[model samples]
Target: GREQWASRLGFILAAMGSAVGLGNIWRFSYVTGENGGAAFLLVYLGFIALIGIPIVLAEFTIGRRAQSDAVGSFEKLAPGKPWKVAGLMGVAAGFLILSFYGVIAGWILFYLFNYITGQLWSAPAEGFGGFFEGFIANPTLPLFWQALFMIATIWIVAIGVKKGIERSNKILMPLLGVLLIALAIYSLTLGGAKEGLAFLFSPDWSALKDPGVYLAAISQAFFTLSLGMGALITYGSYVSKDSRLPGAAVSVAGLDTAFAIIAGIMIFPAVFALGLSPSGGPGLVFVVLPDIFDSIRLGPIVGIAFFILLGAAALSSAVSLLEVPVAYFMRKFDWSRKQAAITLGVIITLLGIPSSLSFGVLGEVTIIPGLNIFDSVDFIASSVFLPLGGMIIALFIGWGWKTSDALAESDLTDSVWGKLWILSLRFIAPIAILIVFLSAFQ
Candidate 1:
């Protein structure tokens, strides 16, 4: 028998935890800044409501109906059919995404410790970029932190659903909410509230003229919801049939969007207060924010709180990613949860070494003209695996499964909303996903 989430709230929070990772803060900020902030956010919210939620409901319906792991769910639900390809891609996406994800989480841990020990209370004499560059380009330091982060994730997951994943989210998610809200308030008090609010809220309508802005918004919406990777499928598998899938789906997506907004409030104000660009790209948090902290009063405390919040977000999301494969192996191979977690967790950690080294020893290795190992893995996993897998899932639910059955599994009566959901999954989502997929090649 498979493990189940201990309570309805427990399951919902865990799903929200999975949805609110680096995608919410790091990726959202840079992508929004790069795409004319407010307009991108508006479009992102629309896509989330229109497309993201329907796929989420579809994933939950499949999982609870089959009550199995990602691949196993498809195998059980559509026996002898090809829909299992979507599930297999999800398991693979889990491994690929988490391998590089842990590397970045490790960087957060390193910064957290430095903030606590007062080493980063003031900016390095060499400046923030040099500190960030020198640290990543050092071969061994990051691997140690990466291993530590993985060990923490593995231990919690190995402990099982109720005591580990469920309990951690119960505590961590609340901490995330409180910490982020407090920081956002503190940030506004720094006198950059006017500029930050304007940057996030006032749209430069001209930027929306670029086709690229819409594509970026749609992709960000997909990734931020943690869709198309069977992560929601695996999480939904642990759900009880009595629970309402539709409500849970909406809640998770709603809270996730709220988190991204709050993070923008927390970060952009400080970025402006310290006279930094909102469009700082990927290093906005690590390289640029440290400078923001250095110039503020009580910077170390603020820095410590921010990184701890980030670490919690990263760990929660990483646990769900690891669960995709861990659950599959446990069921398919008759392995115990601990055995599967330990074995696969270690293997995944080992798989990340080259990604970690890509900044140093493997710096010259590129999958394409410009992308190194880490960049290549991220692009392949996120851009390719996520959207493609999502399209298959929408097709499975809308075309493969009976509408009445899907509605029943989703706890939805045959209402107008239910018909709308079916229609979106069948026509709207697949076309949107295809367009996003085609844009990736450009």
Candidate 2:
């Protein structure tokens, strides 16, 4: 018999862990805070429901119905002509993501080391930013960190799926949640707590009319939810047929969204209290947060905690990214777990070098008119691959697969909302993603 989840709960936890990553805590918090505060939050939630949820369900249906790894699942389900192209696209997206993602994770690990050794607290302002810039400028340092991160990932996968991926989530996910809540509580003590809360919850209806705000919210919804990357589908392959994907997806999205909201709550209050401008761009956590910590009581303790939690979140996500290609190689070539992981790990470690260097050494090498390797990869995925992947998933579920069969296999066929969900998967979600994609360029 094929290996299945030890239990449904295990699968859900693992899946949620994969989705709840640096995006939830670091990226989402910074973006939401910088963009429109609470206005962004409201738009993001709306997109999650109207767009993210349906597409997620579509991926789930495809994966569960086919009951295989990403490439195999699409081939098995669609079965003819060019349907396998989606699977190939998905695998490619995964590989692209892991290559750069591992580099970022390595940065987090380096930061964790700094946090532990009290190096971050010594100079604070000059320390964190200089450290980040120094690492980015030194190609060898980035390579060292990336290699370490990749080794960790390869080691876990080499241990086999159940004990490796699933078990790690069982412990790390809960710890991440607890640490996050604790940090949120700590943040509430800052002077600008009220302002942060208001900024996050006091929705500004006027901002809704802005095309940029709406498009950003929709784009974030897709990225934050981990849709269209075949990550969810790859994980969904491990789920039992009797499991409820809609309920499970909702739970994952809810947890993922909650983390983002809480992160915003935690970050904004501190930023505001410290008198730092909240518009720190991508370096909000790296540049601004350290400054805020230096001014606070028990700064070292809090800073250390925050970075550790961030590292755990980043690591969980990196694991998922690595798994995508590793799983693909395993299924396609029948490579053993250790073989696939080691080979892919070496490749990703090399590929991640440019991204690591983009902060420092390669900063001058703008691949496009204005973007470097890091920004370009993010742009390609966020602007092109992710939306395209979501579109492919929605179209396949809606047109290629039989509705009744999809619903039935999804274990939601008898539910009252099944028909409505099916319709959304086919039309509403795809249209929403398309509009958002076009809006992004405009």
Candidate 3:
């Protein structure tokens, strides 16, 4: 039980890799398009500082001090108290997210295979939408890919910290960054850079009046940073005490924010060049990107690189998701790493089948009035589970623990930054989250 991070760099890459996921590219781009570009980005930056940064420090402080899983960290820190709900909610959120995330990650994998096989070398007779809809709407094939992706996630996490999670991020994180920069450069040159730049940078200023702007910004910041899920709590447990928790939090957030901007540059200009809609929702990557790639010179090769980067990014995230529960059970019941990982991985995979099938077989079964199973899971998690869990974590650190205890754990004792972080958690973050969630509803 003496597992520690191999190095500070190892811990940072793992944390950074965990923070940069589907949101940095897919969600950030789509949400900005819906809101007023720079307006949304500006609000998002404020929330990231107000909400994301504080929670990051708290989770890291909890994990580093206690050296425990999501559940154990709370239980260890505050025994027999309501404070543990944060960790429990985190475990539940992780389960729900991985179930659907595996399904979507499979879609990314399928596209990766397609580009390599040259199926994406030219536009389909019906175009990319036709190809995408047909593939996902299939009954059985997508399920296989989802299961396969889950297996890949388990393979990494089941191998223990040093062999699996830590080492994977070392190479994957840097490669992903390099690939992102290269893709962004190519995308900017596609002649739609002007439109893309305008769309992302120029705010209508009127969109500023909509509450949805702040709502979008808040949710994206919470969702993008992986704050509420205890993935950070789990990852943080692996660090050594000498590590500067604040600096790591800052680096991960800064890189992820920059990464979102870089990803926008990668996606938007190309989307404009292909004459596609920026408001393509989740389909922006899978549906829109293929068509753009096909028309450009050496498009298929770029497609191969793009999806590979996506797959690796997905892998980095999936392991973090699985690790939360794996760490939980390993601490609670003292199970072997392989045992906890495989058992929970299978549970998540089976839970995911309904989501995958909802596109085809179980598509008729509505979880909500209009939403299907897959969408309902996503809706419930993002809307309710994530923010509520985030609120609980902030409250726990702000009020449940003494101020001095938090400062010491964060290695920011008595400093101005530390005091500000506690203040955000206490008054600013929880209030912002409530307003955003309520506004999002009305």
* Best TM-score among the predictions, by candidate number: 3
How well is each residue in 43-65 modelled by candidate 2, as lDDT tens digits? 78988887788788777777776
Prediction RMSDs, each to the true structure: 2.0, 2.4, 1.9
* Quality of model 1 by C-alpha lDDT: 0.86
Instruction: List model 1 lDDT by residue over 1-442, tens digit each.
Output: 6789977687788888899888888888887877778888888888899889999998888888888999999999889999999999999998988898889899999999999898998878888978998888899999999999999999988999888889874666677778778778878888888998988888778877776676677778878888888998998899887688888899989899988999889888888887888786666768767876776688888789888888998898999989999999998899999998999899999889899999888999998568899878877787678878989999998889888898888898889999899889999988887876665457
Which stretches of candidate 3 lie above 4 Å from their native place? 208-213, 361-364
Instruction: Quantify all predictions' global Cα lDDT against the true fold.
Output: 0.86, 0.75, 0.83
TM-score per candidate, chains pooled: 0.94, 0.92, 0.94
On TM-score, the stronger of 1 and 3 is 3
lDDT by residue for model 3 (251-289), tens: 888989998998888788888888888877666777767
Ranking by TM-score: 3, 1, 2
Count residue pairs with overlapping backbones in model 3.
0
Model 3 worst lDDT run, 10 consecutive residues: 168-177
Give candidate 1 regions above 4 Å deviation.
189-194, 205-212, 439-442
**Candidate 2 pairs with clashing backbones:** 137-360
